[model samples]
Target: RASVGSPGIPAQDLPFVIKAGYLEKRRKDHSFLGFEWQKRWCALSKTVFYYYGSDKDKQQKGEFAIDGYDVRMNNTLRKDGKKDCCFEICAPDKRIYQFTAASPKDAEEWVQQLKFILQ
Candidate 1:
């Protein structure tokens, strides 16, 4: 079971496919704060990555298959050109999504694991 603070657990419980954690996700569209970064519970499954609004949310806010997705870390986190422990998902012909981790180390681990899984 997921701990109290960490709520990124998957609903399926399929042997814990991979990693799960809290990440600041950048919203693709406009936002009220004029900046779109929002907290989300993210989980990585065998072939998909899912994000939920919170730990108790039964339905995922969004999910994407990682088959053709490439992981890129140390990307610009904002218009200021700050990297700030950030990572972005790259899809050849599709839109890109960015995420911010709690620390620089945390971001690299996610990037390394994702690269391993993608292969």
Candidate 2:
């Protein structure tokens, strides 16, 4: 089916997106146990996404502009023939971040949603 499209005119309407959270983030640093993932509560804002720790501190451990990054969804099978639950947030200067989803379906939903806001 065909859909609406906002022409070059500034008075046109726009199209599509949503958010889902508790996305487990992978640590991108050096440490003995650096290969660990932590549960993060993500919040969606106007062209910005902020992730906070699982505490009541409300301190944002990380953030990213929705329109300033690249998102890739990975459902590839491992060398051991197992599918992984993960995705990537790529920025300039190789500013990359990884996240592990709870499930395949859930991950796919978030991936497309994030891309929609990207200018």
TM-score for each of the candidates: 0.78, 0.68
Structural RMSD, model 2: 11.4
In candidate 1, which residue pairs clash? none
lDDT, residue 44, model 1: 85
lDDT of 2 by residue, 22-109 (tens): 7877676657464366788765656656666643433566566666788888654222221456777788667777777777776777
- Which runs in model 1 stand beyond 4 Å of their true positions? 1-15, 31-35, 79-82
18-98: candidate 1 lDDT, tens digit per residue: 888888888777647655778898888777888887766766777777887888885656644346679988887777878
lDDT over C-alpha atoms for residue 112 of model 2: 76
* Top model number, TM-score: 1
- CA lDDT, every prediction? 0.76, 0.61
The candidate that achieves the highest lDDT relative to the unseen native structure: 1
